[PDB]
Amino acid sequence: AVVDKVFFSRLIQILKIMVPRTFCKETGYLVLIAVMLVSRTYCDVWMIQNGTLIESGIIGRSRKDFKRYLLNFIAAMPLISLVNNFLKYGLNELKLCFRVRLTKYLYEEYLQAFTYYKMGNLDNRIANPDQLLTQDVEKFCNSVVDLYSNLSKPFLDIVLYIFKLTSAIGAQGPASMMAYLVVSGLFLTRLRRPIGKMTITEQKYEGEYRYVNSRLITNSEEIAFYNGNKREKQTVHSVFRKLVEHLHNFILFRFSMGFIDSIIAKYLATVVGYLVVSRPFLDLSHPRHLKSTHSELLEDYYQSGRMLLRMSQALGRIVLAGREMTRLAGFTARITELMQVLKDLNHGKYERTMIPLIPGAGEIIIADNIIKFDHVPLATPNGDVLIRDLNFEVRSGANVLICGPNGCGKSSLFRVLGELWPLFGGRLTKPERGKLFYVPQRPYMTLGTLRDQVIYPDGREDQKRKGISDLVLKEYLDNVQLGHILEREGGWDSVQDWMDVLSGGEKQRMAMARLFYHKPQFAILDECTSAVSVDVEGYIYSHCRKVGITLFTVSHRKSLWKHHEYYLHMDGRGNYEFKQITEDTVEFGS
Amino acid sequence: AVVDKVFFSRLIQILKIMVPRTFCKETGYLVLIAVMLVSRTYCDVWMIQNGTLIESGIIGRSRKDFKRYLLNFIAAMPLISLVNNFLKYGLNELKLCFRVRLTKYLYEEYLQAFTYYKMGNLDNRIANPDQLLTQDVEKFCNSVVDLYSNLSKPFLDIVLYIFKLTSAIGAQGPASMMAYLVVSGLFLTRLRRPIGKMTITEQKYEGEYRYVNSRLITNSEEIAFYNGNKREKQTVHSVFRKLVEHLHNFILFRFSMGFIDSIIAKYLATVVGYLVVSRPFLDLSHPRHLKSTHSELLEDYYQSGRMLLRMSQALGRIVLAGREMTRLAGFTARITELMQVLKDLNHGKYERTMIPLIPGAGEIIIADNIIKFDHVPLATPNGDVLIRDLNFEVRSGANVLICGPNGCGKSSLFRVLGELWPLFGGRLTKPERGKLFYVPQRPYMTLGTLRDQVIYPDGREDQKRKGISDLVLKEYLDNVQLGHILEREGGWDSVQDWMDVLSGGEKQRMAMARLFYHKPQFAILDECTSAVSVDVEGYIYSHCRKVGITLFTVSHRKSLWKHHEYYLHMDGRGNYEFKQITEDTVEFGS
């Protein structure tokens, strides 16, 4: 966390987005707050000027002045609350507007052309973006406004109290106090160095203690066989003794340092203040400033006495407000990193994935109801190569049955099929993205009603454009024998978490119904028929054949061996076999 | 968290341990702090009495009084720092002493007769005790002293300022201010109810937002196949819109409440103070209290004015200090629960484990070099029964080879063998605990030198009592061919984390050497010979036979089939076979 020119450049570049134009509403609050930061100070000086008049009203034993200068305050306290309680409202609204603007900008690009997937899986620059896109934006927006509202009040306070004291005390009055405060602060900060070196040793020792305890807990059974009671007691005792012996020295040092600090920084600033404020009074020949009565010396002293304290506290506040920039640097760096990675991913670039050209070297031509693999070597984007040159073609009305060992490199073939992963050499044909439905073992279910569940890729008005009525939807559901769910929660206006309301077979049949409704050109089945009867499987396959949808089957079951044309058999080492049908089985064994 | 008589009873019962006697050192600080809590107040009143004299020294334009009452402060500020910086030292030392006492008491019982194992595994009342025994003790000790040092300063402050103001103002002076403060506090607290109902809705909505984002991230791949960009954008937008629409109403309510609060609780307390303090002055015929000069009215007013503020702040502090008991209740409850569970486990009781009598029903007789199972049905302490009645005997010079399926109920037999788990009916013989070494696949290694590693159950002086020299240890190490480790880190005075310094085979051979040195009567081998040569295995078995140590083998290997007398074969369903040796193999198949 470093404050340099780069930090300011990054911050201004980010800020250009949250304040786009000159007449946006986020500039209304920027003046509504400026008009109040300069009224709060006037209210403060008025209050300290009126308090002394009230006090001298009674110290002099006169009821008229007391009554008058008390009513002047009673009838004007309501207006002092509005300023203080309107500044805060302005600040809160400004923070919220900043948050909304930044979040909208980020989400307008985080959900563009598979970026949300590539960032999570295909890149490792950012880990767990769901927290970076939720918790960091709020904190950044809060901090960038806290800094502005904390560096701006003390500045006005000192600028007013150093020009209302150069007429009362003199030119040297405030200066001889500022110099002392600066020098004492430097001296104390230099003295207080060792505290920063013991607070790390304390943490190290505490970590050792907790580690020993956890080690004892984990391996309790092994040490319980041969009298593990004695030794471990000694070990924990030794660690605890080291910790408790360090703490005594820490406490003694804190004691001595506090004793010095009190004298230097609490009981000598007051003496300096007394001397500085007293210089005008204890000089009889002073140039005409004070040749007045007691009831004027009283006010003249106490106004200056109360203003020196408020000028001194402002320095402390403005110095303490300088620890916000070191924190803001981290948030600025993180958000700039996120923006850069989004901009990279929106283009054809990526680094730190999960020999031919890595990013992309091929071409994609879009056709209908046809897929062509002619010299298309597919490989993982990490240097490893799955198979050598591959060549085979699949037409419409045929099937591609997958048989062989566990998933292995087949997952890579699936990912590259639906764009997603890159193309390592070769030319290929494909449909336009949304005709390659891929149903996993557990179908994806969203939060919504049954209509959205069946029509998830689309919405309500989209369904209306398709001219499909509720009765047709009933017929589709009845095909997979899901007609008893309409009454399960009342119908199409029921909102429930479908993850723990439907069984696995019900979800799989729901996915089949969704596929039937959408009627895609190509689909992929990955062991999603674990719990289904033979009759339903036969019916869905027959209906799919009647409609004319090409299907891919990873089942490996004998009935599915029967009900497909082609087969792709690989041994894992890398090889593909493509031919019509063998009479008995694949001529290589299993 | 409830404050009742039970809470006080628990707290006093705990406190009886941390202050055992009457002359312990923890009662020295209890008076060293009492003597300072009553000196700090006197210092405060002296300072407010002397400040007004200094101020009237200059307001009256007289240098002598200014000098005199400034030196009276310069020469007495060093003594005011000692009191403040000695009270804190006393408090810190007292907290640390409490922590040490309580931790020693707890660890004197947490490491007694297998309790550290039963609590972790055999009981579920407490989860993860390593944190309860480290972080809760510190927090409890800090809080029980923070309460004492925070409820005791305001009490003395008010008791002094209500008896130094009943002579200056009058009997009604402080009372008419305390009544107003109480009533205004009640009114504000009643008004501020709705803030407690919106801060839960905010958290609910934020949780929903984060949950939707996490759901999007997890299922990105499935939704990337069919145009998942549009819908999910709408869903996140809807949730964010709900949140950002709630926040506006929250901010507006906060604004209005703050506006009311400022007037009621900041700009009217001052008016009440002015009236109350002014009553004595604005009455010419007052009974002789004030018939003096201006330089006495000034002090008489300002002393009372400064004391009313410090009497008013004390109420706020003492009211705010009442939120510590609600927190301390949780710590007291947790520590009492821990103490009760330790006391239960030290006896033959236990509940919520991981039909015959559950806790224990049998008897244990101690013999030497003999083990007898005559009518000993072993079962898990959860109602499940592993096997029916079991009967077989093992002598000295024989072996018990374990053959069969995976671990299954064999782990239960191991645990019950070395005491630990209970005895469900039957009578049994055993040695005295520490003659049943059980070496897992990965031997247990502690933090220490090689001498401790070989001699872990014992120490240095224990080794000296045994009359074993370093050369004998070299010979033991050379037997398992570990003679090249003495120079690996310089010898017997090297401290390293052995987990990542020795390989699996080296650790296993180290365990064999430890077993050879200890020379137990019985030992258990659980698949710890994964990486060992045939020669070393044969040598260790031959040496063990020569020494005369009975061995148990879970290996299931053919050479180990040869080199054992008896065998125990079980099919998992529950059955045990015990006989000398079959010519070919077990007459049941594998």
UniProtKB/Swiss-Prot annotation, chains A, B:
Name the reaction it catalyses.
a very long-chain fatty acyl-CoA + H2O = a very long-chain fatty acid + CoA + H(+); a very long-chain fatty acid(in) + ATP + H2O = a very long-chain fatty acid(out) + ADP + phosphate + H(+); a long-chain fatty acyl-CoA + H2O = a long-chain fatty acid + CoA + H(+); a long-chain fatty acid(in) + ATP + H2O = a long-chain fatty acid(out) + ADP + phosphate + H(+)
Its cellular-component GO annotations read:
cytosol; intracellular membrane-bounded organelle; membrane; mitochondrion; peroxisomal matrix; peroxisomal membrane; peroxisome
Q: Which residues carry this modification: Phosphoserine?
A: 590
Query: Gene3D superfamilies recorded for this chain?
Result: ABC transporter type 1, transmembrane domain, P-loop containing nucleotide triphosphate hydrolases
Q: Which residues cross the membrane?
A: 28-48, 70-90, 168-188, 257-277
N6-acetyllysine modified-residue sites = 5, 204, 343, 464
Q: What is its EC number?
A: 3.1.2.-, 7.6.2.-
* Localization annotation: Peroxisome membrane
According to the record, mutating residue 503 to I results in: Decreased ATPase activity
Entry binding sites for ATP: 404-411
Record's keyword terms, sorted: Acetylation, ATP-binding, Glycoprotein, Hydrolase, Membrane, Nucleotide-binding, Peroxisome, Phosphoprotein, Translocase, Transmembrane, Transmembrane helix, Transport, Ubl conjugation
Residues in ABC transmembrane type-1 domain copies:
29-316
Q: Which PANTHER family match?
A: ATP-BINDING CASSETTE SUB-FAMILY D MEMBER 3, ATP-BINDING CASSETTE, SUB-FAMILY D MEMBER
Instruction: Give the function comment from the record.
Output: Broad substrate specificity ATP-dependent transporter of the ATP-binding cassette (ABC) family that catalyzes the transport of long-chain fatty acids (LCFA)-CoA, dicarboxylic acids-CoA, long-branched-chain fatty acids-CoA and bile acids from the cytosol to the peroxisome lumen for beta-oxydation. Has fatty acyl-CoA thioesterase and ATPase activities. Probably hydrolyzes fatty acyl-CoAs into free fatty acids prior to their ATP-dependent transport into peroxisomes.
Which family does the record claim for this protein? Belongs to the ABC transporter superfamily. ABCD family. Peroxisomal fatty acyl CoA transporter (TC 3.A.1.203) subfamily.
What name does this protein carry?
ATP-binding cassette sub-family D member 3
**Source organism of the structure:** Homo sapiens
